[PDB]
């Protein structure tokens, strides 16, 4: 979802159905150090860096 | 005759055209369209207009 | 379980937007009933191969 983005659902714009994606902001998936920039939360409940 | 007046709801008795599904004598099937997204409410009242 | 606006905005439009590239198309017309059903009629140039 971060670096590729996510097709999640559709919404209704002005009466035409269109897609809804969510991805990282520009500046946070550009250079390899951005790998460090992200976290996923574990089973034990804390945020874990990549 | 019976079922026009005598009901609370309108009821027809008719014969389909000879030309099964095409071109019933004097007239037309007009289509009114939204082509800019105004509103079902808005277009509905346009049909009213 | 669907009503009309459920029907046009979940299926009718998902379909009418993929109806690209159909041979000799004259017009497309669809019902979106509150009985949950949607029916889309495409009439073709008289006599194009059925």
UniProtKB/Swiss-Prot annotation, chain C:
Signal peptide stretch: none
Phenotype reported upon loss of the gene: Loss of susceptibility to contact-dependent growth inhibition (CDI); inhibiting cells still contact the target.
Intracellular or extracellular location(s): Cell inner membrane
Source domain of life: Bacteria
Induction record: Positively regulated by MarA, Rob and SoxS transcriptional regulators (at protein level).
Subunit structure and binding partners: Homotrimer, with large domains that extend into the periplasm, interacts with AcrA and TolC. AcrA may be required to stably link this protein and TolC. Interacts with AcrZ. Part of the AcrA-AcrB-AcrZ-TolC efflux pump.
Similarity section: Belongs to the resistance-nodulation-cell division (RND) (TC 2.A.6) family.
Function according to Swiss-Prot or TrEMBL: AcrA-AcrB-AcrZ-TolC is a drug efflux protein complex with broad substrate specificity that uses the proton motive force to export substrates.
Designated name of the protein: Multidrug efflux pump subunit AcrB
């Amino acid at each position: 979802a971060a670096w590729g983005g996510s097709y999640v659902n559709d919404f209704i714009d002005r009466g035409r159905v269109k897609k809804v994606y969510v991805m990282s902001e520009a500046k946070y998936r550009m250079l390899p150090d951005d790998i460090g920039d992200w976290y996923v939360r574990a089973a034990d409940g804390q945020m874990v860096p990549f | 005759r019976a079922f026009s007046q005598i009901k609370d709801a309108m009821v027809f008795a008719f014969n389909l055209p000879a030309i099964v599904e095409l071109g019933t004598a004097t007239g037309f099937d007009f289509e009114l369209i939204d082509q800019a997204g105004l509103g079902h409410e808005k277009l509905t009242q346009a049909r009213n207009q | 379980g669907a009503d009309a606006k459920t029907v046009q905005d979940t299926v009718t439009q998902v379909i009418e937007q993929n109806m690209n590239g159909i041979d000799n198309l004259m017009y497309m017309s669809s019902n979106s009933d509150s009985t949950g059903t949607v029916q889309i009629t495409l009439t073709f140039e008289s006599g194009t191969d059925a």
